[PDB]
Design a protein around this ligand. Structure first.
Ligand SMILES: Cc1ncc(COP(=O)(O)O)c(CN[C@@](C)(CC(=O)O)C(=O)O)c1O
Ligand SMILES: Cc1ncc(COP(=O)(O)O)c(CN[C@@](C)(CC(=O)O)C(=O)O)c1O
Lengths: 396, 396
């Protein structure tokens, strides 16, 4: 049976962790996968997290199965994060949430649900976006069509080109929106532009799918849900796939959520019974530990106050790092002006380097970025900033 | 979009946990989902597990992503469990393992791999078996065909009928074997019968798929892998989907493994690059916590000696419970003789009750079994044994 199988090409992102483990030369720099590093280049488990784990260690008496959609505190806490505490979607019981293994698991259970219970056959993704968007939706059988987004030559959101690309989206198909910190560009629609995409989406009959992995990294929890909340004021059905991998530093515990919204409880419930049947045939029920950590920090104001400050320390150090990177590049004499980096959001910057510039940065300098020129600003530290900028200036 | 969606029927097993939470009357008995209970009717987190968690709490410095196939200690430890420490499959580097969320996740990543990288279009499952076998393989696009297995009228393995059913399986398709403690019958092939199914499978070109969730519950770790090991002496390719949910009491942490075997490393590696591409498009990479617990107990002889005795205390209490159930049923005057229960393996017994007998046991007596008459013997305790047998005698 297996004689004739080909070798999958490597993942543009996770495969990059592979020559970084395989390269010797201690000056190695890793600007690849989006994982936060502190000033000492480490990705610490958060204090609020270590405390929540302490509590669970002493206070847990069973590891008996959780039930398809996971722990209920978790769902009500993520709905209040995404929607706001006093929301009409929450009071009208219009939203149901299934705890999933990470945001990727949530995009896949949404993809499998859609493919099997709906008439959807096309998902629209931005050009560019996270490469795994394409594989998840194609795994479920959906075809992925692309919309314009980034104005490269000018480093902005090409709102015209976005709208006009989208004029080809049919009533009834899915458009994927990034909640905040668009991956890979760091450019997000302003609130006026989000309510324009909100108005146009109910007019055209697109079903909105939000990928919301970075809540907290652009401006703050409340401010980052603004585009999604504008969308949930105008739509009767939406799906949001969110993750707590980055804002709780819980990367490897696989903690996310798939929230289904429908017009009333009876419908969302009937729709969610199907979403649960899709989870049962995939992984059965979700991993308890990372989601219990989130539930216990979010259910306790002392732990939530500490967590909430660790998240704004993360956001601010990253913002310090992209201030420093532009300045150091200018002090290392760059032909190009990189002022635009400072306008982008979250942990990455779309540098503008060509594929051959990032190939030789790796080969010649041990500097690891993703082939699209996406650079992880959250992995830059005051110490590696001078070798890194010097590698970049020598390649421009 | 969601207006026209139907409501999935309830899961024959997990749905049962729902009227148990919804029924009042304190005499409720739950013989539904296969979850071990101790003499006090609780499903404790194991001591070796609480200790491993202690170690992890103090000794872990990051929650940074694990990488598609999960933690490497875990894979080498499960290969040595499944195959034996001095195995030729291990020394020849013929086997690769991806850590998955539970055994269900491992059956699904094997199903998705097969569907997408192989010419397989049919999977053969026993009649009867675990109902979710059918949904997992149909989710990936495979069709499920069934083979005879249980001789109901006599309570044995119908080996003839099994062979003759299987004579319709084509060269190149998948036959699903339960490693030990067949779910739902508790009847397993003896070693002579396993090597007969081993000889016939290489002769007919079936690819063997082993579902191995209960290693340790029939006779012991080593003795329970005997059928699988006989199969890995004769086959060049095999897939085993195993779980640590029950033998480590780690149910809700979603800990399992999908082990791919091929004829040589270069091939198994080329095949596994594809299995990893399927995981990436599903959940990205696995939940660390439950699999780190397993790795640290299995990597340390003090923790492994303690764990290993907690597992044989589980197995033995269950064996005490099915001794007690037959006896008490006979002391409560059953028309039928239930001596056959004592011959079955693992945590369940295929009672022989009709669907209407288990419906009224629930309705009239608050006694919860699965609709096939599958009863969880591991949930029977010295205290609930007399109400339970009296409910059963009043229904025969
Ligand atoms: C846009 C987006 N959505 C989801 C995820 C994955 O979240 P998870 O499953 O909860 O871990 C990501 C993650 N992107 C990373 C950080 C890592 C990856 O490739 O999975 C990246 O861009 O390097 C994003 O970005
Ligand atoms: C035969 C078999 N294979 C896999 C699993 C699930 O293992 P997991 O994903 O690691 O939890 C099971 C589990 N069967 C249970 C105990 C629960 C269930 O329906 O998932 C049952 O029979 O009640 C089995 O049996």
């Amino acid at each position: 049976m297996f004689e004739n199988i080909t070798a999958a090409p490597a993942d543009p992102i996770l495969g990059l962790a592979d020559l970084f483990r395989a390269d010797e030369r201690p000056g190695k720099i890793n600007l690849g996968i989006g994982v936060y590093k502190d000033e000492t280049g480490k990705t610490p488990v958060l204090t609020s997290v270590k405390k929540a784990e302490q509590y669970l260690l002493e206070n847990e008496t069973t590891k008996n199965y959780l039930g398809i959609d996971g722990i209920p505190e978790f769902g009500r806490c993520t709905q209040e994060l995404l929607f706001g505490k006093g929301s009409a979607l929450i009071n009208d019981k219009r939203a149901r949430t299934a705890q999933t293994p990470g945001g990727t698991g949530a995009l896949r259970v949404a993809a499998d649900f859609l493919a099997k219970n709906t008439s959807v056959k096309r998902v629209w993704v931005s050009n560019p976006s996270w490469p795994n968007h394409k594989s998840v939706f194609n795994s479920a059988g959906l075809e992925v069509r692309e919309y314009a987004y980034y104005d490269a030559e000018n480093h902005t959101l090409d709102f015209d080109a976005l709208i006009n690309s989208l004029n080809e989206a049919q009533a009834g198909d899915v458009v994927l929106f990034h909640g905040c910190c668009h991956n890979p560009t760091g450019i997000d629609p302003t609130l006026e532009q989000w309510q324009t995409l909100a108005q146009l989406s109910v007019e055209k009959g697109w079903l909105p799918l939000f990928d919301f992995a970075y809540q907290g990294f652009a401006r703050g929890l409340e401010e980052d849900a603004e585009g999604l909340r504008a969308f949930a004021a105008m739509h009767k059905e939406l799906i949001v796939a969110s993750s707590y991998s980055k804002n709780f530093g819980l990367y490897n515990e696989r903690v996310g959520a798939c929230t289904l919204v429908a017009a009333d409880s009876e419908t969302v419930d009937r729709a969610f019974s199907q979403m649960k049947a899709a989870i049962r045939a995939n992984y059965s029920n979700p991993p308890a530990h990372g989601a219990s950590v989130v539930a216990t920090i979010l259910s306790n104001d002392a732990l939530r106050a500490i967590w909430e400050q660790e998240l704004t320390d993360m956001r601010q150090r990253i913002q310090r790092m992209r201030q420093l990177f532009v300045n150091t590049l200018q002090e290392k004499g760059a032909n190009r002006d990189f002022s635009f980096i400072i306008k982008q959001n979250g942990m990455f910057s779309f540098s503008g380097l060509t594929k051959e510039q990032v190939l030789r940065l790796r080969e010649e300098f041990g500097v690891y970025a993703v082939a699209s020129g996406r650079v992880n600003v959250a992995g830059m530290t005051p110490d590696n900033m001078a070798p890194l900028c010097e590698a970049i200036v020598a390649v421009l």
